[PDB]
Structure 1
Amino acid sequence: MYLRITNIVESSFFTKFIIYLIVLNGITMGLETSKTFMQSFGVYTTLFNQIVITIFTIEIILRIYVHRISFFKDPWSLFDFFVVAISLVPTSSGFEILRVLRVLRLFRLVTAVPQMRKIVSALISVIPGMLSVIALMTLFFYIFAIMATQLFGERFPEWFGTLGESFYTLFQVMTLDDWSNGIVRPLMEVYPYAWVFFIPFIFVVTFVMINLVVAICVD
């Protein structure tokens, strides 16, 4: 039977059947958005939803026998596993994000279409040659975040009161989002020299990010 299923699973129709479900269940989830639609077709969809989870667990179970250890060593497969696994955790007990994280399964469209896998892989492959910079930056943030917590969090504890808060605020300044009226102008009303802290920060963090981009435009 091994070769029987290995011919069922490895079949085009099998694959094309899965993709057809994903696009369908994907459509169905944009409908579960409507409060109106749920009051008219909620059950239609909730069963349709419970159905697909099996078909996908059936699929994932087959796929494992046909592949054994080769499966748990495949990124795309591992993914599909974990995503389907999340959707298996019962509706009620635990966190309620798990109900929401179910929609992560639409990323199977990525996993189950080679044209997607290409672009995704092409993207990810750039990350290794960025880790040195990414590490640098994180170290940088961490140092400034600490300085900021102890420079401004007594008078400005919403923004800088905690090391985590400073991280977020510093992130916000790095995206250049409402950084002067929204953050540094207020701070100067108490700390006139705060610009000595945030302008260099902006220079460094911006410089780094141009390199990181230009780094990518070479490799």
Structure 2
Amino acid sequence: SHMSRKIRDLIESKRFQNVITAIIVLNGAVLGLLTDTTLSASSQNLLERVDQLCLTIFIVEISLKIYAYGVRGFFRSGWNLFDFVIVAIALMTFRIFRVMRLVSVIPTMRRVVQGMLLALPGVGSVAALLTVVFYIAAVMATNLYGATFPEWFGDLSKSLYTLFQVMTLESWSMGIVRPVMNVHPNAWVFFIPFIMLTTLTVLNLFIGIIVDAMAITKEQEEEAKTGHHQEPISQTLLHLGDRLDRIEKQLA
């Protein structure tokens, strides 16, 4: 009650954030050392104890939190939920995903991720268009080339894999298209438009994400620092037409 409020003053301090950070890093360094196959059984045992400890400190932390905010208002944050699952799941195979908590706990990092997630809706149609082009290209490539080139095109899955490699431009010619053209001389009529269209569309997708993500993140950094953001130049002129219509009705 006064307890509830004094704990939150802990939870929300600089020093406590620094301590959870330091433990994420330590847990991460330890999962890193464990990839090393040459370790003694004792070394591995130790490292596995440091990990147990790290996981334990996280349970407390989360408890401190589920308490000092209650079940309703902890689980009202996606980051709390994510922190929750991440930690809880470890009480039941890629443990190293725990290092993602550097993102949930460091606010400037969290704001980068939020900008990117929030940008995803407005490129949904560019992405769907890419999806449709892939699907169509993969069906045609399977029918065209599957019998003569089955490792690359022998079924839909193979085709999609190969076309993704082709869109990334990786050995698309020496490794895929020239060998195809030795058997199907006009295959460039398929592959060259595929490349032009997917590279255009994937860059549209990337640029749209990045331009929006950056604008979102920047507003969030403003709000977090000062409680508000910059009004769009649009509003500034909208509102400049409220105070000019009034200065003209005054001026009569």
The answer to whether TM tops 0.5 is yes
Counterpart residue identity of residue 25, structure 1: N
Counterpart residue identity of residue 113, structure 1: I
Q: Is the alpha carbon distance of 1:211 and 1:88 closer, same or farther for their aligned partners in structure 2, counting shifts above 3 Å?
A: same
Task: State how far apart, in whole Å, the 1-side matches of 2:4 and 2:38 are.
Answer: 42
Note if 1:107 corresponds to 2:123.
Answer: no
User: Which residue matches 2:179?
Assistant: 186
User: Which residue matches 1:131?
Assistant: 124
User: Which residue matches 2:34?
Assistant: 32
Q: Which moved more, 1:109-118 or 1:73-82?
A: 73-82
TM-score (norm 2): 0.74
Note if 1:72 corresponds to 2:75.
Answer: yes
How do residues 81-100 of structure 1 correspond to structure 2 at under 5 angstroms?
Answer: 81-89=84-92, 98=93
Residue 5 of structure 1 deviates from its aligned partner by 4.9
Query: Which protein, 1 or 2, shows the higher relative CO under an 8 Å CA cutoff with sep ≥ 6?
Result: 2
Task: State how far apart, in whole Å, the 1-side matches of 2:137 and 2:149 are.
Answer: 15
Residue 17 of structure 1 deviates from its aligned partner by 2.5
Residue 211 of structure 1 deviates from its aligned partner by 3.1
Residue 160 of structure 1 deviates from its aligned partner by 1.1
Residue 30 of structure 1 deviates from its aligned partner by 2.0
Q: Is the alpha carbon distance of 1:51 and 1:182 closer, same or farther for their aligned partners in structure 2, counting shifts above 3 Å?
A: same
Task: State how far apart, in whole Å, the 1-side matches of 2:148 and 2:103 are.
Answer: 48
Residue 197 of structure 1 deviates from its aligned partner by 0.8
Residue 8 of structure 1 deviates from its aligned partner by 2.6
User: Which residue matches 2:25?
Assistant: 23
Note if 1:196 corresponds to 2:189.
Answer: yes
Aligned 8 A contact 1:86 1:102 in 2: no
Task: State how far apart, in whole Å, the 1-side matches of 2:51 and 2:150 are.
Answer: 45
Residue 54 of structure 1 deviates from its aligned partner by 2.3
Q: Is the alpha carbon distance of 1:123 and 1:30 closer, same or farther for their aligned partners in structure 2, counting shifts above 3 Å?
A: same
Aligned 8 A contact 2:7 2:64 in 1: no
Task: State how far apart, in whole Å, the 2-side matches of 1:186 and 1:10 are.
Answer: 66
Task: State how far apart, in whole Å, the 1-side matches of 2:36 and 2:209 are.
Answer: 42
User: Which residue matches 2:3?
Assistant: 4
Aligned 8 A contact 2:103 2:109 in 1: yes
Counterpart residue identity of residue 26, structure 1: G
User: Which residue matches 1:207?
Assistant: 200
Task: State how far apart, in whole Å, the 2-side matches of 1:159 and 1:10 are.
Answer: 59
Residue 117 of structure 1 deviates from its aligned partner by 1.1
Residue aligned with 2:127, SS:
helix
Task: State how far apart, in whole Å, the 2-side matches of 1:159 and 1:215 are.
Answer: 31
Residue aligned with 1:192, SS:
coil
Structure 2 gap ranges (5+): 213-252
Identity of aligned pairs, percent?
49
User: Which residue matches 1:92?
Assistant: none
TM-score (norm 1): 0.85
User: Which residue matches 2:109?
Assistant: 116
Aligned 8 A contact 1:57 1:84 in 2: yes
One of 125, 149, 152 as aligned partner of 1:156: 149
Q: Which moved more, 1:31-40 or 1:65-74?
A: 31-40
Q: Is the alpha carbon distance of 1:69 and 1:38 closer, same or farther for their aligned partners in structure 2, counting shifts above 3 Å?
A: farther
CA RMSD of aligned residues (A): 2.1
User: Which residue matches 2:65?
Assistant: 63
